[PDB]
Amino acid sequence: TEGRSRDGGLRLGEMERDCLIGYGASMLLLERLMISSDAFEVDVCGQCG
Amino acid sequence: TEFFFHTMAGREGLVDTAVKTAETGYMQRRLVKSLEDLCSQYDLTVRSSTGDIIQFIYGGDGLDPAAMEGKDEPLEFKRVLDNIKAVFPCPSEPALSKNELILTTESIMKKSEFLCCQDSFLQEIKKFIKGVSEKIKKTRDKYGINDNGTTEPRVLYQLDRITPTQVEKFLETCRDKYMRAQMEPGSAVGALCAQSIGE
Amino acid sequence: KRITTPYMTKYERARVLGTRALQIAMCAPVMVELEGETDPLLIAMKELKARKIPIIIRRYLPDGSYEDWGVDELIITD
Amino acid sequence: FSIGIGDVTPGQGLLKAKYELLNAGYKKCDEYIEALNTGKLQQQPGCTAE
Amino acid sequence: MLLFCPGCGNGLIVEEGQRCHRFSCNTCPYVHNITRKVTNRKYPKLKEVDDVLGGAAAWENVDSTAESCPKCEHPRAYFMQLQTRSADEPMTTFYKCCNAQCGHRWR
Amino acid sequence: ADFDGDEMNLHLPQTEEAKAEALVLMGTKANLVTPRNGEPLIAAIQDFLT
Amino acid sequence: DDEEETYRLWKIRKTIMQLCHDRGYLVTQDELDQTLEEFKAQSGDKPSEGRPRRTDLTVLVAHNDDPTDQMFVFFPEEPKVGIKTIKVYCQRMQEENITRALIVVQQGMTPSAKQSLVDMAPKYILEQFLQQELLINITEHELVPEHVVMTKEEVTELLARYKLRENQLPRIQAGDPVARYFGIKRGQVVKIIRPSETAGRYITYRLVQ
Ligand SMILES: [Mg+2]
Numbered sequence A: 001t002e003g004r005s006r007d008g009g010l011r012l013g014e015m016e017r018d019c020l021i022g023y024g025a026s027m028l029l030l031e032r033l034m035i036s037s038d039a040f041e042v043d044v045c046g047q048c049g
Numbered sequence B: 001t002e003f004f005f006h007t008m009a010g011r012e013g014l015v016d017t018a019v020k021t022a023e024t025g026y027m028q029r030r031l032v033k034s035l036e037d038l039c040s041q042y043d044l045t046v047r048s049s050t051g052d053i054i055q056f057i058y059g060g061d062g063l064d065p066a067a068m069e070g071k072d073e074p075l076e077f078k079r080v081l082d083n084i085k086a087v088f089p090c091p092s093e094p095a096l097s098k099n100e101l102i103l104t105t106e107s108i109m110k111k112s113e114f115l116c117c118q119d120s121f122l123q124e125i126k127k128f129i130k131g132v133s134e135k136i137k138k139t140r141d142k143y144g145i146n147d148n149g150t151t152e153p154r155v156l157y158q159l160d161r162i163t164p165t166q167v168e169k170f171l172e173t174c175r176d177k178y179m180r181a182q183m184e185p186g187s188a189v190g191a192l193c194a195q196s197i198g199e
Numbered sequence C: 001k002r003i004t005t006p007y008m009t010k011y012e013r014a015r016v017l018g019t020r021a022l023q024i025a026m027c028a029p030v031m032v033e034l035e036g037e038t039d040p041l042l043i044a045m046k047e048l049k050a051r052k053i054p055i056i057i058r059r060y061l062p063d064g065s066y067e068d069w070g071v072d073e074l075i076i077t078d
Numbered sequence D: 001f002s003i004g005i006g007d008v009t010p011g012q013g014l015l016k017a018k019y020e021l022l023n024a025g026y027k028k029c030d031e032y033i034e035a036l037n038t039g040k041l042q043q044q045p046g047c048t049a050e
Numbered sequence E: 001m002l003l004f005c006p007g008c009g010n011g012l013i014v015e016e017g018q019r020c021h022r023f024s025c026n027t028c029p030y031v032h033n034i035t036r037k038v039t040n041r042k043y044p045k046l047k048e049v050d051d052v053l054g055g056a057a058a059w060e061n062v063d064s065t066a067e068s069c070p071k072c073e074h075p076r077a078y079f080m081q082l083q084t085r086s087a088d089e090p091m092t093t094f095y096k097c098c099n100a101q102c103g104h105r106w107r
Numbered sequence F: 001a002d003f004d005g006d007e008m009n010l011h012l013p014q015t016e017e018a019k020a021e022a023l024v025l026m027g028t029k030a031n032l033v034t035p036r037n038g039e040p041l042i043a044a045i046q047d048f049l050t
Numbered sequence G: 001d002d003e004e005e006t007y008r009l010w011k012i013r014k015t016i017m018q019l020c021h022d023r024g025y026l027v028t029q030d031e032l033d034q035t036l037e038e039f040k041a042q043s044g045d046k047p048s049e050g051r052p053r054r055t056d057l058t059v060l061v062a063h064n065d066d067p068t069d070q071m072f073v074f075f076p077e078e079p080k081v082g083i084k085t086i087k088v089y090c091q092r093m094q095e096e097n098i099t100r101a102l103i104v105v106q107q108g109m110t111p112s113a114k115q116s117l118v119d120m121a122p123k124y125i126l127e128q129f130l131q132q133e134l135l136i137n138i139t140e141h142e143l144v145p146e147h148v149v150m151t152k153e154e155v156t157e158l159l160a161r162y163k164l165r166e167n168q169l170p171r172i173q174a175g176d177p178v179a180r181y182f183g184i185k186r187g188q189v190v191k192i193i194r195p196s197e198t199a200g201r202y203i204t205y206r207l208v209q
């Protein structure tokens, strides 16, 4: 969620993404943006795609 | 009236700062979106996301802008030579003359490891060594010093002292600094340009 | 023969350290005697200093070929 | 280490110097305007009189 | 410059339908055949002629006398003047010097 | 930052890989010179110069 | 006047023949330092000079490898070249049995002939320019680096060195003024030697597309 009235969670904006790209750290922004935001598991059919 | 004119002039800066929040941010957004994919490969090339060649060698030299000591050059030969002279005084060894300096420099640089270095860098080192070897000659001539080292007021040998150990140390330091100042493979060489122009 | 530079680039250092730290976090034998440290990353740093990390780098070239380098034969510097 | 009003109060000779400079500058400006309004002013060869 | 018919008060036109031209209306039959001169116009309009002689055009305009710079004074810039807009407005002059790597040119 | 009421965020990476990458590539000690032209940024500040 | 037209004629002759020499065709050195007074010596004044013929040149041949290969240079006179004129040049061309030709127009040339100038024949190709462009040789310009066209062996060795497929190189447009100057066709690679701010040099290559 977004606010402080509700419990929050700070934002990794569109500029921090470019900073982390600039550092060249490839696993750290993966951990920041998928592992600890909305890592979800699905199932896909390869026959139909 | 002065108070009113002063406030009138002042508010322009506030308005300018308020406006500035948009244009530079948008320009940096576009630029970083455009330049994001470029990377430095193991062939010393830089290639796009599809393997297309953008450059055959990064920036011509292949050197890292952040490791530059001089004005866009990796060294200032005078500064390194002075540091090596100061930290490694040679109280026992004899001062070199022009011919001996040239001979020993040529002998040291002849080794294979220096041939592995970049050619233009060797040209620069030769130029600087020739320059200092020419400078020492004027000083030795003006005071009438003998290269045999037998002059009686020995303080005259303090004017432009340089000894083989100092030459070796200077050359090794120059080469080492040059080798470690390169742009490493894998570098995000595209985003750095975008940030460095946008900021 | 091998053409790529003999220095270990900072990216190789980062990923080798991270992978070895993750290996040590899971129950894995530690090569070098440990004084009593309890943080896996420090143990990985000591393993790198002693040059005992059992990892091999594979430098992939854009044309498809590759070169294998052992962690103990790169020039680890400051 | 401190800063006070004594550190920013103007000196004596500064007042005389500023007075003289102000008078000289104002007089020079008045002569330039006098030269213009009668047409005597020489046009600098980069722009018109204004 | 314009004329109006005294008979009805409208702009007239010129036309030829007989041995001599005439100043004629079109809503009323007023005709005034012209037989003398008039000495004023509408001041026509054609655009800025800039490069019709650009560069080094016909060298017939070689001239001897020229001014000199207040600073440097090498032998190459003879003098020039030109014009501003139209018939009855002043004519401007600029004095311009050019060797390389600057931006000097006076008015 | 200037300590006039400013605020700053903080993140705690949740992995050994992320920890290592952050420490080695983003460490403060490894970033003493700005990459625009290689000039230092972290140096003394006012009242340490005086 | 009557000197400035001849001045232009002399300059365009100099530039076109420099281009011919750089392309490698046969040319004589003594003609390279031709002076404007020399041009007046070898050709009369403007009233005595007929534009459509007084500058025609075809002596140049590919002596470097095939002296039998000859080149045509034609100089129309009318401001815009018509279809009948280009037909005249093409029929004279067929009479002389050459493969390629070159045209220099004063101001332009009609859209019908614009279209025609691309589909006369696969075996024949014609080169078109303007006087304004040829009044100065861009290869002597300050900004332009040195372009060198290179043979098939050299390009093969190049793309064997860096391990490329030929379509990964940077591209130079077929219509680029320097490409037109060297007349190179699609599928060719040009070395460029960029002068560094120091004594050093950078080398890059571009592929015509
Ligand atoms: Mg603040």
Ligand SMILES: [Zn+2]
Binding pocket: A045, A046, A047, A048, A049
């Ligand atoms: Zn399915």
Ligand SMILES: [Zn+2]
Binding pocket: E005, E008, E009, E010, E011, E025, E026, E027, E028
């Ligand atoms: Zn009427």
